[PDB]
Amino acid sequence: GEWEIIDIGPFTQNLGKFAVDEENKIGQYGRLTFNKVIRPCMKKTIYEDKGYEYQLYVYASDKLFRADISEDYKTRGRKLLRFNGPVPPP
Amino acid sequence: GEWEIIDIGPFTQNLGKFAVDEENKIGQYGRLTFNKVIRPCMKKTIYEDKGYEYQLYVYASDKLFRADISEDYKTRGRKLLRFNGPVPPP
Ligand SMILES: [Mg+2]
Ligand SMILES: [Mg+2]
Ligand SMILES: [Mg+2]
Ligand SMILES: [Mg+2]
Ligand SMILES: [Mg+2]
Ligand SMILES: [Mg+2]
Ligand SMILES: [Mg+2]
Ligand SMILES: [Mg+2]
Ligand SMILES: [Mg+2]
Ligand SMILES: [Mg+2]
Numbered sequence A, B: 001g002e003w004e005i006i007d008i009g010p011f012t013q014n015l016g017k018f019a020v021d022e023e024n025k026i027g028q029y030g031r032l033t034f035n036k037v038i039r040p041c042m043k044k045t046i047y048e049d050k051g052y053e054y055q056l057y058v059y060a061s062d063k064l065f066r067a068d069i070s071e072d073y074k075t076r077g078r079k080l081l082r083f084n085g086p087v088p089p090p
Helices: A010-026 B010-026
Strands: A002-006 A034-060 A063-072 A078-084 B002-006 B034-060 B063-072 B078-084
Touching: A010 A034, A010 B034, A010 B063, A010 B078, A034 B010, A063 B010, A078 B010, B010 B034
Parallel strands: none
Antiparallel strands: A002 A034, A034 A063, A034 B034, A063 A078, B002 B034, B034 B063, B063 B078
């Protein structure tokens, strides 16, 4: 769920050719001849999880610390981004 | 990105074990003994493009149509999601 307007260059003209080609196959609008795509062209991006970052409060040796951890979704590898303390309780 | 609060169950406790284990390797706070992860725990999600949807105004046979096209990022299959018209110029 992210939106934007994109320019109407060659990539967008190729999108219009595909749509007219596909509609000609369906036939519900006769035989159509592609002319051009005009402004505006709106584009939605659908996302998927690449990775994560966690911010923790962690007790260690009865003292409280802040830690940031990063995690890859595919390999599940983790990195310590930050570790400091003692910090006051939240 | 996108942010959320998560529960502090076994997955979050193991996040704290990782952070303390890694900090012990660095050594700046001496030898630390993991106790627990406490509230609150915040989680950020990093996103990658899964696919797209394009909303076009396209001239075909000198008539103006609205068309929506989807596009999968990895397999690159495109699909015609909608095609109607004539529509008034935007
Ligand atoms: Mg914009
Ligand atoms: Mg272009
Ligand atoms: Mg134009
Ligand atoms: Mg996902
Ligand atoms: Mg101890
Ligand atoms: Mg759990
Ligand atoms: Mg608690
Ligand atoms: Mg990407
Ligand atoms: Mg014609
Ligand atoms: Mg198709």
